[PDB]
A paper describes a structure:
Self- and homotypic interactions of ASC (apoptosis-associated speck-like protein containing a CARD) can mediate the assembly of a supramolecular complex, ultimately activating caspase-1 by an unknown mechanism. NLRP1 is also an adapter protein, which along with ASC bind to themselves or each other by homotypic interactions among the death domain (DD) contained within them (e.g., PYD, CARD). We found that the CARD of NLRP1 (NLRP1CARD) and the CARD of ASC (ASCCARD) interact with each other in solution and cells.
An investigation of different linkers between MBP and ASCCARD found a linker that allows the crystallization of MBP-ASCCARD. The structure was refined to 2.0 Å resolution and exhibits excellent agreement with the cryo-EM structure of ASCCARD in filaments with an root mean squared deviation (RMSD) of 0.502 Å31. The crystal structure confirmed that the structure of ASCCARD is not affected by the MBP fusion tag. We generated a high-resolution crystal structure of human ASCCARD and discovered that CARD structures are highly conserved with a six-helical bundle with a Greek key topology. Each of these three asymmetric interactions were observed in the cryo-EM ASCCARD filament structure. We found that the Type I interaction mediated by the residues from helices 1 and 4 (Type Ia) of ASCCARD and residues from helix 2 and 3 (Type Ib) of a second ASCCARD is highly conserved. The Type II interaction formed by the residues in the loop between helix 4 and helix 5 (Type IIa) of ASCCARD and residues at the helix 5–helix 6 corner (Type IIb) of a second ASCCARD is less conserved. The Type III interaction formed by residues at helix 3 (Type IIIa) of one ASCCARD and residues at helix 3–helix 4 corner (Type IIIb) of a second ASCCARD is also less conserved. Structure-directed mutagenesis on ASCCARD demonstrated that the three interaction types of the DD superfamily play critical roles in ASCCARD oligomerization.
Author numbering: 1 to 459
The structure:
């Protein structure tokens, strides 16, 4: 369904998709080829479902951590840049898009979280995490708060979890050891325990998400946030005089954010592989194309040597790279998505007091290499489950409360009912998710078996 002779691109909604569209309207202005830029919700979860059916985009943009799983699933075309083009990008970015010795995507830009602070509220940002509670007590007297950031995505809390010793998968003897997971060790527990103590002492709210924290910082209600380069654009538009600096230390050790390399992969099922090769090598990864995107939403430290040189003088980019050097490059192994789902649940349940830090991380450690059926097939289940009330009755009193049950029933359509149902699942642990799978098996076995079958077809 990917029609030949055009280019469809998926990029995340927080990136500069209008800047990328400008690169595509010039590509169309030169070669006659139309390119459409799209930013669907959960594109990175849907791509494995739509690529295998000959749909989805020609080019998918995401951070490199998802790409090893796509490559293992046969969903990405091997990219064959010349040795002369490879020299235009830094070698460590090519390493991030290398899976089994082969290049599976084009590196675009290096991303790391930084501490972003309001210089009018906070001329001297805290050097340590341990200072933040006293800061917040001082700024609550003025009607403000110290810090707000997204607690719903584990990416934003990971720098604190890794500071004192948490890690994802240990790199040993040239490869990531998936039997050596570090999310429930003492250092991980110490970091998450500090986060929980911030919530307990009313220095943070467990409900804070991306838009709440962005709105709070950009309206001058909070003195700091934690975010990446893509967010700077909306702060420039605000009236906030902001700085970008090193993340606070924790127990005297740097916060260790996971470093992402924004990357562009080519659908293995695309009949436009060489039109995507030419758009990526000759129109995006130029100084002109990267500036069209970076001027929409900043990219961070771009992988193209010639343009990075120009932008490296930005103190915001210098701070991004200081944080990046204290952190670690994300693995790209297929187990990363299961790892992220496991840590999302642990962080959300610890923050809300539904689990202790110890229990939440112990559960995450056990599940870090196994991707659950309903997480893998969320979008297809929303679209294709037909008897929602039967699932609701099977979950009532085990996994669904009456307040949750009523919220789902109040939704008008089956996809919107399932959407609402799935909005509760980040807090469910493995056995709760198993209950939904067993209910689906009893009422719609053909659907489960269909999804299982197509997943195995990728191996
Ligand atoms: O929490 C569930 C979530 O886990 C996985 O998402 C992770 C991304 O794979 C990972 O790249 C990182 O995402 C951040 C991007 O790197 C960055 O460009 C920017 O957009 O912020 C993103 C975080 O919001 O971290 C997330 C985990 O937080 C998995 O791929 C998702 O499908 C899954 O929903």
């Amino acid at each position: 369904k990917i029609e030949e002779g055009k280019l469809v691109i998926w990029i995340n909604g927080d990136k500069g998709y209008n800047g990328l569209a400008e690169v595509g309207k010039k590509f169309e202005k030169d070669t006659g080829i139309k390119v459409t830029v799209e930013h669907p919700d959960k594109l990175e979860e849907k791509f494995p479902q739509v690529a295998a059916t000959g749909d989805g985009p020609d080019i998918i943009f995401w951070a490199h951590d998802r790409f090893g799983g796509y490559a293992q699933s046969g969903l990405l075309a091997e990219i064959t840049p010349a040795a002369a083009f490879q020299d235009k990008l830094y070698p460590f970015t090519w390493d991030a898009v290398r899976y089994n010795g082969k290049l599976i995507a084009y590196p675009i830009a290096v991303e790391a979280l930084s501490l972003i602070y309001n210089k009018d509220l906070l001329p001297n940002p805290p050097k340590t995490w341990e200072e933040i509670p006293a800061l917040d007590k001082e700024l609550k007297a003025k009607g403000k708060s110290a810090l707000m950031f997204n607690l719903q995505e584990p990416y934003f809390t990971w720098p604190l979890i890794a500071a004192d010793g948490g890690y994802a998968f240990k790199y040993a003897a040239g490869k990531y050891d998936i039997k050596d997971v570090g999310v429930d060790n003492a250092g991980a527990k110490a970091g998450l325990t500090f986060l929980v103590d911030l919530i307990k002492n009313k220095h943070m709210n467990a409900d804070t998400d991306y838009s709440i924290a962005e709105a709070a910082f950009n309206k001058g209600e909070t003195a700091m946030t934690i975010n990446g380069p893509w967010a700077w654009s909306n702060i420039d538009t605000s009236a906030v005089n902001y700085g970008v600096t090193v993340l606070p230390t924790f127990k005297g050790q740097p916060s260790k954010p996971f470093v992402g390399v924004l990357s562009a992969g080519i659908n293995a099922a695309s009949p436009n592989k060489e039109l995507a090769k030419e758009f990526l090598e000759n129109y995006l990864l130029t100084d002109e194309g990267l500036e069209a995107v970076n001027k929409d939403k900043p990219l961070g430290a771009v992988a193209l040597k010639s343009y990075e040189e120009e932008l490296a003088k930005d103190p915001r980019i210098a701070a991004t790279m200081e944080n990046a050097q204290k952190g670690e490059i994300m693995p790209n192994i297929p187990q990363m998505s299961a790892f992220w789902y496991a840590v999302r649940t642990a962080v959300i349940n610890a923050a809300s007091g539904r689990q202790t830090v110890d229990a939440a991380l112990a559960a995450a450690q056990t599940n870090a290499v196994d991707l659950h059926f309903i997480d893998q097939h969320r979008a297809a289940l929303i679209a294709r489950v037909t008897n929602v009330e039967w699932l609701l009755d099977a979950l009532y009193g085990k996994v669904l409360t009456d307040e949750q049950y009523q919220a789902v029933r109040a939704e008008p359509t089956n996809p919107s009912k399932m959407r609402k149902l799935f909005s509760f699942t980040p807090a469910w642990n493995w056995t709760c998710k198993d209950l939904l799978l067993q209910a689906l098996r009893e009422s719609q076995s053909y659907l489960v078996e269909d999804l299982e079958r197509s997943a195995a077809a990728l191996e």
